[PDB]
Amino acid sequence: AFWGASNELLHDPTMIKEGSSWYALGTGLTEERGLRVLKSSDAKNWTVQKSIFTTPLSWWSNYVPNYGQNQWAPDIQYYNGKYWLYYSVSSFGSNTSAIGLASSTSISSGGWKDEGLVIRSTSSNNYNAIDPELTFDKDGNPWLAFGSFWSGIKLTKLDKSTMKPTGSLYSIAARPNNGGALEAPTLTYQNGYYYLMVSFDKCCDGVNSTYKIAYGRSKSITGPYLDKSGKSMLEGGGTILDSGNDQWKGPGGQDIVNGNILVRHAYDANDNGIPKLLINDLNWSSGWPSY
Ligand SMILES: [Ca+2]
Ligand SMILES: [Ca+2]
Helix, strand or coil, X not given: CEEEEEEEECCCCEEXXXXXXXXXXEECCCCCCEXXXXXXXXXXXXXXXXXECCCCCCCHHHHCCCCCCECEEEEEEEECCEEEEEEEECCCCCCCEEEEEEEECCCCCCCCEEEEEEEEECCCCCCCCCCCEEEECCCCCEEEEECECCCCEEEEEECCCCCCEEEEEEEEECXXXXXXXXXXXXXXXXXXXXXXXXXXXXXXXXCCCEEEEEEEEECCCCCCCECCCCCEHHHCCCEEEECCCCCEEEEEEEEEECCCEEEEEEEECCCCCEEXXXXXXXXXXXXXXXX
């Protein structure tokens, strides 16, 4: 079922439970520094907390010299006794970007240790190092998906002791004939399959907001991810979970929480087109994700 939509603005959400509260994190407000943090007791009515990175980290300028003041598209998990917070440092439209990592033993305390650079991109790369997603393979070991535009969604294994990349960089979703207009991966292993969801974006309106949520599955984490029709996500495949409705436009930025909750943003046609946090239960019983 549909849990509801938030009061508070949130874009590119991730969410996690800590004690008697839920925390939802998102892209920082454009006019502020850092990452946006919301807290609630009911996952519906949220209060805005002090942001993460109200002070920027000094190393960011070494990789993204004219980074925008807000950081983007956080991702969080608790693993091996710590919270791991991946996030994006970038500037609007650019593929000169970096994904950073911070760690904590408590979200409510608001203390984060800088773990440094995860992966970066420059104009010389055919991908954009934003929109991280931490996932776990069938052996419980960590991997990172990321990407936005250019040749699309990438995947690397992570070293379980440093939480940074190891091995080769794999390609797992692309839209070669629609301008590379996809972003924001989320990836989970359920019932013997790897599932990849991505946001398909508008390619051609000069704004490139999210538009639909699309999915595919694969027996191996490195793909190919195939949609319900059998089409590979590397060739623009992806079955549409959600294309919005009368009130809620451009759903995207989706993240799978606890295996069976889907959070996402969508833009409120009844409230100035502001992106809000929408949450549904997720069912996998069909072989595929469903509301
Ligand atoms: Ca995300
Ligand atoms: Ca996630």
